[PDB]
Design a protein around this ligand. Structure first.
Ligand SMILES: O=P(O)(O)O[C@H]1[C@H](OP(=O)(O)O)[C@@H](OP(=O)(O)O)[C@H](OP(=O)(O)O)[C@@H](OP(=O)(O)O)[C@H]1OP(=O)(O)O
Ligand SMILES: [K+]
Ligand SMILES: [K+]
Ligand SMILES: [Mg+2]
Ligand SMILES: [Mg+2]
Ligand SMILES: [Zn+2]
Ligand SMILES: [Zn+2]
Ligand SMILES: [Zn+2]
Lengths: 268, 100, 252, 227
RNA sequence: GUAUGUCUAAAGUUAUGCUCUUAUUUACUAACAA
RNA sequence: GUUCGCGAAGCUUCGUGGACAUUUGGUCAAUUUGAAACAAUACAGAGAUGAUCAGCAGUUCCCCUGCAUAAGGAUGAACCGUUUUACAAAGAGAUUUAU
């Protein structure tokens, strides 16, 4: 159920400000301009990070220029935000490019339609979107299913071959995927560019997880024990005298583990 | 006296107002425009002036200043405060350490 | 005079130089405008242009307005907006210094904010915390393409250069340190010169290394720490006292 | 945090208008002292005045120094902070400095402390300021056409600007070295030199107890030459 | 062989019982050869 | 400039009183001197302990990559250095001083 209170859209919000103007531009123009824009954005981000050795190709296919020093390599492992952004632009760059080709006098409209259809049904095979965000397999699978459905309603009496267009339902799928992800990428890339600008938060504090549960447990335990002993101890002894205590405890634990009775004489 | 109901209403009003404002501040601060919808003039002498907040481009960072600085806090314990325990144990207090 | 004529263009934007200096490294960095993948060799070079003030200085859009700041690119001698520039185009004087004297405590004559501390070099625009008027003038060896001149010759040429751009409090060349200390009448003036002769040449048309002026490394005009010399320290103190007497009488 | 402290801007600075319209960008810059976010305020002094005035430092910093947030001058006397600290050091005391820590971490820390600096303690309370002022007050009470001269007996403290201006009043180029005092003055024309000489610590030959003076000159000159 | 970590990358801040000679072991180390 | 009233020449033209409309942007300014980061050359090449190994922590006015409160950066790095007093009471011997 869509929540109703949030009736300040993104575009509306942007419209409200001065820094945007509006124009009537051809969709191809919009596309090409957005490839140019996107390219400039991603390059700006990468260079900002410092790693100029990652050359963006104009086809949004990122690759390193030089052989990478291990440090450099570590630096350049861009995350699932940036790569996902790239992949979406790759997707877009494909279809927009196909339109350009069509309109640039290369290919016929049927050829265009087929091209677009091919792109949508082979987003997996044309842009490793799945790599970064694997739930896109669902989308890919859906597209495949559509193709299977469509073709066999498109090729009843007609034989086999590649020349079917009809890109609608797949296109719908991709739109809904983008709808799904727009929030995710606003968060992800939001945080990313925030990190680029503001440093990362220095109140890191890690949660417990399966991997560090035991260590945390044990530290909590020894803190508790130490506290109790200090409460007990009437002299108000130093932290260095607590080291003896906790070390004693540790030994005791080990003794228990062994099943050797832990009977140190000098204790209270 | 257990506090007055009327005065509890006061305190609640004050503190509730405060915390609501604080949370609003926290929210409109954050980059997630999603959380903008849960948000519940001056003079610099005898001389007078109008304060304004110019709306900025929603591309450029909202808060250019903040950059996650490490900052050490000065304590500011300007007023001294005692630590004040009343006891004097000699017999049990000296016999015990030999055991402890 | 400067006020008699409109300011000529230093150089048309066709003649202006691009923002892609020297390929110092293997690849260009878009968000920084610097180079990268290699910092082999020093970056600095000699200014192609110079403020020839009488041939250049004049009226502006600013001289109409009462813009209180002078054109950095005028000082550098490369302003591509001549009379159409908002920032002014002439040597700072008592009238203009006096005019901006309120604001110039916090920031330069180039209308850019000063900082808490000098940039470790004493190299960048001055700190607000000091009211310094004294420019250190390093890199004279580099500024003359290793021309074995006389100390007298050096100091004279230096005098010719900085006296042209602002009223001098004093200058003194140091043979033992191969540098200048060029105290100015006003902080605005100091600021102006400090940019106006940054990365410049001390060479002249009469000198034989005139066509090699570009190829060296320019004047290192930075700001000066006050001398350890107690001979001048005392003088400084006296000056401070005098100034204090002025302001203190002015309070009532 | 909440916008609890108001901005600390002085009068002269701000300009003589009954109502200006300034803007506040909150968390709007690191300050010029303590590298620390604060609410940046800014305004054109007039509507059609081109120069914006932006609040350089943070309010805590301002309070700490007890200054304007745009001028960096004391809010009372409209004078450089260092200068005012010197004045304060001079009257009533021997030592009053306001040491800013030039290390990026420590400066922040210092800024955070709600404690006035040396001179700020005086200038905050107006009574004390007044007292200081009154104490200060108490404390108070032959022409061969050479175009090129060689002037001597130059006070060590005098600057070239004073010299040239004096000459102008008595009316070009000038060379002075405060070591030697061989004030190698040169005029833009010989006629101008004539004019000057005809118009006449002004000891002045025309080369191209005076004895002792010559000696003092001599030794100083020699020393200069060795340098 | 690496992570990783240091290093360099140029412009001058104004003060007056032993020494010896050898041969042998053992250990460790060695992106050096077998 | 439009228009609505008027006057002076021929519904047309020149002059007059109105109404309409009446404050843009800048925290910035074009290359060295107000700030990145690796990179290259050189040098070493990795915590326990004898040797070889998985790590998870912790403190840190160290951070980086990461969407991250996953995780990973060599167990990410540094932590291994330095280290004197709440200083007492009792006895014995020797020296001095005084009564
Ligand atoms: O089933 P998929 O693995 O998605 O592969 C299909 C399938 O090929 P296979 O049957 O060999 O797997 C289609 O063949 P048909 O079942 O329709 O005979 C074919 O469709 P066309 O016959 O219409 O070409 C289509 O190929 P295309 O993508 O060129 O339409 C192709 O997809 P892939 O080429 O991606 O394997
Ligand atoms: K870890
Ligand atoms: K660790
Ligand atoms: Mg590891
Ligand atoms: Mg390991
Ligand atoms: Zn200009
Ligand atoms: Zn002010
Ligand atoms: Zn501050």
């Amino acid at each position: 159920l869509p929540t109703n209170h949030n009736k300040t859209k993104l575009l509306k919000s942007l419209k409200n400000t001065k820094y945007f103007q509006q124009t009537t531009i051809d969709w191809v123009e919009a596309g090409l301009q957005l490839c140019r824009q996107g390219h400039n954005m991603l390059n700006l981000l990468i260079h900002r990070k410092g790693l100029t050795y990652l050359h963006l190709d104009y086809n949004f296919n990122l690759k390193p220029t030089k052989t990478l020093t291990t440090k450099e390599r570590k630096k350049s492992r861009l995350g699932n935000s940036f790569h996902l952004m790239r992949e979406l632009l790759k997707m877009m760059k494909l279809i927009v490019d196909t339109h350009v080709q069509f309109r640039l006098g290369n290919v016929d409209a049927f050829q265009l339609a087929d091209g677009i259809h091919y792109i949508l049904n082979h987003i997996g095979q044309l842009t490793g979107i799945y790599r970064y965000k694997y739930k896109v397999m669902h989308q890919i699978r859906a597209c495949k299913d559509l193709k299977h459905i469509i073709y066999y309603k498109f090729n009843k009496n007609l034989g086999k071959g590649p020349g079917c267009g009809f890109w609608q339902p797949a296109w719908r799928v991709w739109l809904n995927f983008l709808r799904g992800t727009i929030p995710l990428l606003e968060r992800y890339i939001g945080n990313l560019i925030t990190r680029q600008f503001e440093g990362r938060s220095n109140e890191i504090v890690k949660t417990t997880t399966k991997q560090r549960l035991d260590a945390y447990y044990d530290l909590e335990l020894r803190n508790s024990v130490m506290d109790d002993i200090l409460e007990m101890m009437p002299e108000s002894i130093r932290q260095k005298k607590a080291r003896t205590i906790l070390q004693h405890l540790s030994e005791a634990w080990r003794c228990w583990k062994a099943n050797i009775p832990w009977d140190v004489p000098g204790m209270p | 006296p257990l506090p007055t109901k009327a005065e509890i209403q006061e305190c609640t009003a004050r503190t509730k107002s405060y915390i609501q404002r604080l949370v609003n501040a926290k929210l409109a601060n954050s980059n997630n425009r999603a959380s903008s919808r849960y948000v519940t003039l001056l003079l610099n002498n005898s001389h007078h002036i109008e304060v304004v907040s110019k709306q900025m481009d929603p591309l450029l960072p909202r808060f250019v200043g903040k950059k996650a600085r490490k900052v050490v806090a000065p304590t500011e314990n300007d007023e001294v405060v005692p630590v004040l325990h009343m006891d004097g144990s000699n017999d049990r207090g000296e016999a015990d350490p030999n055991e402890w | 005079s400067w006020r008699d004529k409109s300011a000529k263009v230093q150089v048309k934007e066709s003649e202006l130089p691009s923002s892609i200096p020297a390929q110092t490294g293997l690849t260009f960095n878009i968000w920084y405008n610097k180079w990268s993948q290699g910092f082999a060799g020093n970056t600095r070079f000699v200014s192609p242009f110079a403020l020839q003030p009488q041939l250049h200085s004049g009226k502006t859009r600013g001289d109409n307005d009462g813009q209180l700041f002078f054109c950095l690119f005028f000082a550098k001698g490369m302003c591509c907006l001549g009379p159409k520039c908002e920032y002014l185009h002439h040597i700072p004087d008592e009238e203009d210094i006096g005019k901006l004297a309120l604001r110039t405590e916090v920031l330069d004559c180039f209308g850019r904010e000063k900082f808490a501390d000098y940039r470790e070099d004493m190299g960048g625009i001055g700190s607000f915390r000091k009211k310094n008027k004294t420019l250190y003038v390093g890199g004279i060896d580099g500024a003359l393409n290793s021309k074995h001149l006389k100390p007298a010759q050096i100091e004279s040429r230096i005098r010719f250069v900085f006296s042209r751009l602002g009223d001098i409090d004093r200058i003194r060349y140091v043979e033992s340190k191969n540098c200048g200390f060029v105290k100015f009448k006003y902080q605005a003036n100091a600021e102006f010169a400090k940019e106006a002769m940054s990365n410049q040449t001390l060479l002249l048309p009469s000198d034989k290394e005139w066509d090699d002026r570009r190829e060296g490394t320019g004047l290192l005009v930075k700001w000066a720490n006050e001398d350890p010399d107690p001979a001048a320290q005392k003088r400084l103190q006296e000056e401070l006292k005098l100034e204090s007497l002025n302001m203190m009488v002015h309070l009532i | 945090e909440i916008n609890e402290p108001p901005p600390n801007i002085c009068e002269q600075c701000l300009g003589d208008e009954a109502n200006i319209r300034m803007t506040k960008i909150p968390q709007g810059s690191e300050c010029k002292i303590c590298t620390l976010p604060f609410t940046l305020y800014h305004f054109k002094t007039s509507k059609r005045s081109n120069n914006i005035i932006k609040t350089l430092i943070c309010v805590r910093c301002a309070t700490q120094r007890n200054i304007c947030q745009c001028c960096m001058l004391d809010s009372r006397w409209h004078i450089p902070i260092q200068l005012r600290d010197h004045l304060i050091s001079l009257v009533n005391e021997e030592n009053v400095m306001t040491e800013e820590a030039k290390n990026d971490m420590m400066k922040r820390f210092l800024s955070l402390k709600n404690v006035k600096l040396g001179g700020a303690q005086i200038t905050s309370d107006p009574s004390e300021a007044d007292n200081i002022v009154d104490k200060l007050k108490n404390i108070l009470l032959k022409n061969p056409s050479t175009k090129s001269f060689f002037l001597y007996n130059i006070d060590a403290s005098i600057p070239e600007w004073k010299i040239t201006d004096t000459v102008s009043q008595l009316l070009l180029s000038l060379i002075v070295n405060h070591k030697a005092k061989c004030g190698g003055l040169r005029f833009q024309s010989s006629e101008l030199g004539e004019r000057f000489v005809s118009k006449i610590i002004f000891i002045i030959p025309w080369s191209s107890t005076a004895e002792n003076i010559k000696l003092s000159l001599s030794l100083n000159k020699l020393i200069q030459l060795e340098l």
